Paper text:
[name] is an extracellular soluble nonglycosylated tetrameric protein synthesized mainly in the liver, retinal pigment epithelium, pancreas, and choroid plexus. [name] transports holoretinol-binding protein and is a minor carrier of thyroxine (T4) in the blood, whereas in the cerebrospinal fluid, it is the primary carrier of T4 (5). Extracellular misfolding and misassembly of [name] lead to the formation and accumulation of amyloid fibrils in a variety of tissues, which gives rise to distinct progressive clinical syndromes known as [name]-related amyloidosis. WT-[name] homotetramers or heterotetramers comprised of mutant and WT subunits dissociate into monomers, which can rapidly misfold and subsequently self-assemble into amyloid fibrils. It is well established that [name] tetramer dissociation is the rate-limiting step for amyloid fibril formation.
To test this, the dimer–dimer interface was stabilized with the well-characterized [name] mutation by generating the double mutants [name]/[name]- and K35T/[name]-TTRs. We took profit of the fact that [name]/[name]- and K35T/[name]-[name] double mutants do not aggregate significantly at acidic pH to solve their crystal structures at pH 5.5 at 1.5 and 1.4 Å resolutions, respectively. As expected, no major structural differences between the pathogenic mutants and [name]-[name] were observed, with overall Root Mean Square Deviation (RMSD) values for the Cα of 0.24 Å for [name]/[name]-[name] and 0.15 Å for K35T/[name]-[name]. On the other hand, in good agreement with the molecular simulations, the BC-loop regions (residues 36–40) were remarkably affected in the double mutants, in one or both asymmetrical chains. Indeed, putty-style cartoon representations based on mean Cα β-factors show much greater values in these regions, pointing them as the most dynamic in K35T/[name] and [name]/[name] [name]. It is worth mentioning that the higher flexibility of the BC loop in both chains of [name] matches with its higher instability revealed by the thermodynamic analysis. The contact region at the tetrameric interface of double mutants, which consists of hydrophobic interactions between the AB- (residues 18–28) and the GH loop (residues 105–122), was preserved. The presence of Met119 keeps all those interaction residues virtually at the same positions, which allow the formation of key contacts in the presence of the second amyloidogenic mutation. Gdm.HCl-induced equilibrium denaturation revealed that the double mutants exhibited lower stabilities relative to [name]-[name], all displaying a single transition, with midpoints Cm= 4.3 M for [name], Cm = 2.6 M for [name]/[name], and Cm = 3.2 M for K35T/[name]. Although the crystallographic structures of the double mutant variants were very similar to that of [name]-[name] at the same pH, greater flexibility of the BC-loop (higher Cα β-factors) was observed in the presence of the K35T and, especially, the [name] mutations.
Numbering used by the authors:
A (entry chain A), D (entry chain A): 10 to 125
B (entry chain B), C (entry chain B): 10 to 100, 103 to 125
Write the structure that this text describes.
Amino acid sequence: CPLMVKVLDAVRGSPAINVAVHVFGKAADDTWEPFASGKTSESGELHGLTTEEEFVEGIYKVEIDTKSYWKALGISPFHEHAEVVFTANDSGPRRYTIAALLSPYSYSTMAVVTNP
Amino acid sequence: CPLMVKVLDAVRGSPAINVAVHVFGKAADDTWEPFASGKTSESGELHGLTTEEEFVEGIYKVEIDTKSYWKALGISPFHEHAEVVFTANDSRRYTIAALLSPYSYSTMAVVTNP
Amino acid sequence: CPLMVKVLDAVRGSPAINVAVHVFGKAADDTWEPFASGKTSESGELHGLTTEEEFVEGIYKVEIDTKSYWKALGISPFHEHAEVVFTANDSRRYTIAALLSPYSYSTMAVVTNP
Amino acid sequence: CPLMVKVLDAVRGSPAINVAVHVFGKAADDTWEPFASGKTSESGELHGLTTEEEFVEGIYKVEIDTKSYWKALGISPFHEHAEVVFTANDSGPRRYTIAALLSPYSYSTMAVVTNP
């Protein structure tokens, strides 16, 4: 698991379950192209998005669908989504955990990067 | 104004108004003793807590009474209060900000120079 | 002033000065097009981006060029930039704040009323 | 594990390793008394602090020694420590994960509370 995404809900003190996540790579002509997608589990975690072989070096965007999450809970939030844009694997393969802590009008995001 | 406290509400996207804030200095016997207090204004800010003369070097605690803020809004919160503990050092204006959610808070210190 | 951006540095405890900020509106073909831009001031603030007349309802993106800020400080950062995407809605002043660290950021929106 | 503490370093993008943590309970006369202590592992996590039987209902304070953490890395930080004060187990036993994301002049803390 070279890429994992973890999402937490700061209103409820719980994993944020069933949150849609779309990952994009920047292509040769500098457009975003779809790379992987999935939804968080009951643990708030999304594993299995990619493999070490497919996750080549480049710029990636992880878009977390926070607006649909909040609306289904009765809340009209500020953000359309949370976006995390970063260069990956440019010094060789790494493992990335992208965490997001969500509130209706704010979010915090953190990455942990490790070398296996 | 050596010390200012700013509190924001991440559920409503607004200042956190009428939040009680207590500041304590840490004394000889090493116990906390009240130093200054107030309630945040409509802008979520609390000015006028202390003076340059009084705010000497030492360890201070700022307690923000977040539980009462959430209770008044009908929202079950996790923490009893948020606590910010730090040493003042002469080299300054301290702005202590806190962003509140029911099960999380973020706090930041901006230290700036005259 | 319908829109203000404030950027703070959690490594130094200071405003984040001279940070480039780009705002985009999201147009017909659904592409992002430049709307306003500027650099944060010595207080970490960027005022004057748009007007009430121009800031109509719609989806906007604020991109804060955090990578260049950290590079100028000699600190290896994680993100290319921080992005804040939201819909403006008539019912208002928007303050978008971002607290920066090299591998994390927090962002908050304060929406207030005249 | 009714109580776990996880600490992350936002300067380095890594677990915060070997961070001292002291937990206190509020006693009958309303003084803080020592309840448990430990240090974070290489994963940034501190497990084994207490048992369901010992972790009775009450007010607890988790003090994370962030100042010593930063100083050993060459950084003179703002806070003496990060403090997390909460009532626990007052509606029956729960499991608490207390997370803290650390920077030199800021921290964020989040709790996830689950019912086993």
